[PDB]
Amino acid sequence: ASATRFIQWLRNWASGRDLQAKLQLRYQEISKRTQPPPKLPVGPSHKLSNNYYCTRDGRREAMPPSIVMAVSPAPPIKRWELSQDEPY
Amino acid sequence: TYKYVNLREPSMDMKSVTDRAAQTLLWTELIRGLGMTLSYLFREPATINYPFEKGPLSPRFRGEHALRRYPSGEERCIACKLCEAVCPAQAITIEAEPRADGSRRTTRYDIDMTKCIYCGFCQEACPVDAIVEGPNFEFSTETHEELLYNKEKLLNNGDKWEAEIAANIQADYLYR
Amino acid sequence: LEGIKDRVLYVLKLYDKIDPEKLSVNSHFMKDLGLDSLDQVEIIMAMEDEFGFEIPDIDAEKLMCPQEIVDYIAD
Amino acid sequence: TGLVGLAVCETPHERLKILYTKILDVLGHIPKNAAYRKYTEQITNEKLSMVKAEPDVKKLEERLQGGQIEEVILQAENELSLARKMIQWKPWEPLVEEPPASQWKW
Amino acid sequence: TVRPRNDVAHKQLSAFGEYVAEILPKYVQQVQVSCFNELEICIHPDGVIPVLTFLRDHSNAQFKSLADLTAVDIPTRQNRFEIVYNLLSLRFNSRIRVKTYTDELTPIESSVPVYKAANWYEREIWDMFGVFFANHPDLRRILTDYGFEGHPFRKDFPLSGYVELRYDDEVKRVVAEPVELAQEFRKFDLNSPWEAFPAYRQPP
Amino acid sequence: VKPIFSRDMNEAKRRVRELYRAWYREVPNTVHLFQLDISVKQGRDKVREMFKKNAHITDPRVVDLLVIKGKMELEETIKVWKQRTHVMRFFHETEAPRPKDFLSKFYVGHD
Amino acid sequence: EYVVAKLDDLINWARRSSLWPMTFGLACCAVEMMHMAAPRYDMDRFGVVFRASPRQSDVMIVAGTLTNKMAPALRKVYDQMPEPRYVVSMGSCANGGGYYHYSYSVVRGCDRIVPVDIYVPGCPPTAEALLYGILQLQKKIKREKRL
Ligand SMILES: NC(=O)c1ccc[n+]([C@@H]2O[C@H](COP(=O)([O-])OP(=O)(O)OC[C@H]3O[C@@H](n4cnc5c(N)ncnc54)[C@H](OP(=O)(O)O)[C@@H]3O)[C@@H](O)[C@H]2O)c1
Ligand code: SF4
Numbered sequence A: 001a002s003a004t005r006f007i008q009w010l011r012n013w014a015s016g017r018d019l020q021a022k023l024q025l026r027y028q029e030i031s032k033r034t035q036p037p038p039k040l041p042v043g044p045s046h047k048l049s050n051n052y053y054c055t056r057d058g059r060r061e062a063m064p065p066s067i068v069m070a071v072s073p074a075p076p077i078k079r080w081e082l083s084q085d086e087p088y
Numbered sequence B: 001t002y003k004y005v006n007l008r009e010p011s012m013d014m015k016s017v018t019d020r021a022a023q024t025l026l027w028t029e030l031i032r033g034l035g036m037t038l039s040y041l042f043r044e045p046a047t048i049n050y051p052f053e054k055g056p057l058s059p060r061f062r063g064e065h066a067l068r069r070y071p072s073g074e075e076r077c078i079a080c081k082l083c084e085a086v087c088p089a090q091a092i093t094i095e096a097e098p099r100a101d102g103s104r105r106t107t108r109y110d111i112d113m114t115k116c117i118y119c120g121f122c123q124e125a126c127p128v129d130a131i132v133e134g135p136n137f138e139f140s141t142e143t144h145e146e147l148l149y150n151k152e153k154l155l156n157n158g159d160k161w162e163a164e165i166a167a168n169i170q171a172d173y174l175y176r
Numbered sequence C: 001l002e003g004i005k006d007r008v009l010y011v012l013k014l015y016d017k018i019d020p021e022k023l024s025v026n027s028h029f030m031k032d033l034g035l036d037s038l039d040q041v042e043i044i045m046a047m048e049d050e051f052g053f054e055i056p057d058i059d060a061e062k063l064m065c066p067q068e069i070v071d072y073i074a075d
Numbered sequence D: 001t002g003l004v005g006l007a008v009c010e011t012p013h014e015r016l017k018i019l020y021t022k023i024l025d026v027l028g029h030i031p032k033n034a035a036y037r038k039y040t041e042q043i044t045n046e047k048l049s050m051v052k053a054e055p056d057v058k059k060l061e062e063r064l065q066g067g068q069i070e071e072v073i074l075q076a077e078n079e080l081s082l083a084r085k086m087i088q089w090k091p092w093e094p095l096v097e098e099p100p101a102s103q104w105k106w
Numbered sequence E: 001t002v003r004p005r006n007d008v009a010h011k012q013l014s015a016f017g018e019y020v021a022e023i024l025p026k027y028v029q030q031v032q033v034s035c036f037n038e039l040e041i042c043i044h045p046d047g048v049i050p051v052l053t054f055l056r057d058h059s060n061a062q063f064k065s066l067a068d069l070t071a072v073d074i075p076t077r078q079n080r081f082e083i084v085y086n087l088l089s090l091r092f093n094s095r096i097r098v099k100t101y102t103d104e105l106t107p108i109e110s111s112v113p114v115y116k117a118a119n120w121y122e123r124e125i126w127d128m129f130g131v132f133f134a135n136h137p138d139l140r141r142i143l144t145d146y147g148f149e150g151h152p153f154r155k156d157f158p159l160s161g162y163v164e165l166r167y168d169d170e171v172k173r174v175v176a177e178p179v180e181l182a183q184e185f186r187k188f189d190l191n192s193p194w195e196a197f198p199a200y201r202q203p204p
Numbered sequence F: 001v002k003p004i005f006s007r008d009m010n011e012a013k014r015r016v017r018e019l020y021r022a023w024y025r026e027v028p029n030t031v032h033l034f035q036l037d038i039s040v041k042q043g044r045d046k047v048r049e050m051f052k053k054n055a056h057i058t059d060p061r062v063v064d065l066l067v068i069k070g071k072m073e074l075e076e077t078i079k080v081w082k083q084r085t086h087v088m089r090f091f092h093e094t095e096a097p098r099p100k101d102f103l104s105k106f107y108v109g110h111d
Numbered sequence G: 001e002y003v004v005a006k007l008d009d010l011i012n013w014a015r016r017s018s019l020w021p022m023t024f025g026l027a028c029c030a031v032e033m034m035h036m037a038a039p040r041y042d043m044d045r046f047g048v049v050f051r052a053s054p055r056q057s058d059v060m061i062v063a064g065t066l067t068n069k070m071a072p073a074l075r076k077v078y079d080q081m082p083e084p085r086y087v088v089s090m091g092s093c094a095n096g097g098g099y100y101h102y103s104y105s106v107v108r109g110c111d112r113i114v115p116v117d118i119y120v121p122g123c124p125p126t127a128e129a130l131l132y133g134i135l136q137l138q139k140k141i142k143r144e145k146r147l
């Protein structure tokens, strides 16, 4: 038999709940040809006035200072508590 | 945020010990392992019969090299060598010459498939949009000579795929 | 004593680097026989392999004459 | 009780106190004017003052160590080996080795 | 302002530029460099083992882990190779670089007793660069062929190699080696005129 | 004050003598256990042509580095690794070289 | 005659029905090779099985990069293969070196070691394009074994 009604009872019986979310799972809500032609938004630039590269430095501060030739490198990495969602 | 893996011996006395001992005297977990495979058999196989059904693809896909042209004839490529410099495999070879009538175009244009890792930089570095990557797989050959594409002669044979190319480029301008 | 003088002389003549008339028993490989610097290392390797391989690098400098090499191998 | 690593799942108090008192004697053999003796002493005595103040406290084990009390002892176990190696091969007191050729900028 | 990255922990990390320097050996320290919350220390080749025993199990600086053991090949200097020991602390959460310098053919003091992972990276440097390491157990070729000539990275020899082409010729089983012909690599002469950056140019 | 690699001046030559002694005894092992290929006599001649190229002894560091290199390329066949006659063949047999002459090289095509 | 010509078609059909491969890994290609096993692009629908069987196998699919170290390794395998054998170069590395063509350690595309019958062009050779490593091979079996 290939009828879905009787088979869906068998797959639900043999370990765990199934029915919904199939193996193929490409029936509904799969949009073909994506969408109607969209307009991509512009960032903090594009709009004129006060768009100088003097303000937007990017690659300017890069020169390495030569140093010298009790102190820690950072405050010590404190351990985090166990997860609230699942203890174990 | 610190999860744990080990349960540290869940069995204590009588009820919690014997059921854990049951899955070693008899099996049960083998039957539980059988159960997941049983439900997996009854659900339909997700298979695609290749010569009749085809696998899902994108509007912007890279696989086959073909150079496009304008609607009123005329070779779109300009011989900037721009696509040559970006090419990470250094696959695309180009010799430029004037076409004796003012216009600056191509003479030699070999994109060998012995090289090229199908990265699609030449598709995205071309200012004139000459090389557009056609969604094709049908190019398996017997020899190297049959595989490596010659000076435009096999690339302007990509005009046979230009009906798809002109439709698929409608996702490129104003990106996706 | 007789075996050491017979086996080593037969092994040296078989190498074909020196003539039988050129080297007999006392004629040294360093100047008299006519052997190269690499040939001295080759002759010492061939002589050790025939009788009993126990030749160190320190004794190789001392082993230049075939009569001295036969005395060093016996001792 | 259960330790994280392969270090034994046990907390031996005062055993940590033995190790820290031992290394103070190790530091005072050859380096005296050197900064290695100066900097290690002000950290170790700072820890010793906090260990002696609070016995068998989880907050005391968390003081600049993070993990378990056995892990803090393991972080001081090879410190005795580091101090002994500093005594045998000593760069803390002398400075005489050759400076390099003037080229380091890329 | 949008687009650049901000730094605040530079001053807190610069304290190590004083701390390790205050130990003060001519045997170790030499020059200290610090930029974008990362420390670069270049150390004399004679001391490497006593340098790496420090920063290991030390109460103030506890690194314990060696992630990278990269080597820089540069022909400009008399000391050709700049071997960089990249260390990572898991207790303090900070990264440090232990740079060294070695010339054409001089052995450095290898960190086999200090780090158990070093030996695999130590074999890699001897393959690619040819820098021999003293007190090393079993120095073997890993990436190179079992009959390979020269050292694969060295800027002295070309990208294509010398024994590149391998035929299955007239001999039934033996694969050919010594043929040196190959397809030409288009070395593009790309280098932009005008210096783009201030605070980098040096007077002659 | 300065690195010496392994030996100082004189002992480095004795290491080459030690290397030649070990490698001379390994050519029967590379024929019977490995593969016949050419000959036992020609295999010993293959050693001589390799050391004749290294006639330029000038530093203890250069000699010792070649000894360490020699204790890997010739140590490869002692503890037998994957070569299978295709690898570990130093002598060129597949390609025929052009002789060094003003009349021979100009006729064929050189420089 | 006509009886012999139709009999030679049956011998060709025996290979056209079933091809059992020894798929070489040693590549990023090897994952796309494993996508043949993946149910979406099924290959066990043909007479092709992922049992491999190195001594028994017919059509060795060389996937991806071949270095100088692996160059004598693949050659000795090809000699141990039965006489009706085909070689599929899978990926741009196996064709002529997609990347690493100008590198010192990579052999320039399989053919210098082992003769290739069918070339699969794509870096990630899509399971669409890889089914030309089977169906186009099956199409190419005409042979014309007359005598
Ligand atoms: N060592 C010796 O045996 C020896 C000694 C002295 C002289 N020679 C000379 O050197 C040559 C060596 O060749 P071989 O004996 O090694 O060749 P072979 O192994 O006998 O193979 C001959 C091949 O050539 C093709 N062929 C021959 N005659 C043909 C024809 N009339 N039409 C179409 N195809 C033909 C066959 O292909 P198909 O099967 O497709 O037809 C066959 O595969 C000989 O010609 C011989 O005269 C040899
Ligand atoms: S393909 Fe495009 S970028 Fe390349 S030469 Fe032609 S026009 Fe220029």
Ligand code: SF4
Pocket (backbone or CB within 6 Å): B083, B086, B087, B088, B089, B090, B091, B092, B111, B116, B117, B118, B119, B120, B121, B122, B123
């Ligand atoms: S897709 Fe990439 S590798 Fe291929 S020809 Fe274009 S730029 Fe070169």
Ligand code: SF4
Pocket (backbone or CB within 6 Å): B117, G027, G028, G029, G063, G064, G065, G090, G091, G092, G093, G094, G098, G099, G122, G123, G124, G125
């Ligand atoms: S062709 Fe592409 S995917 Fe295949 S091995 Fe080469 S780089 Fe990897």
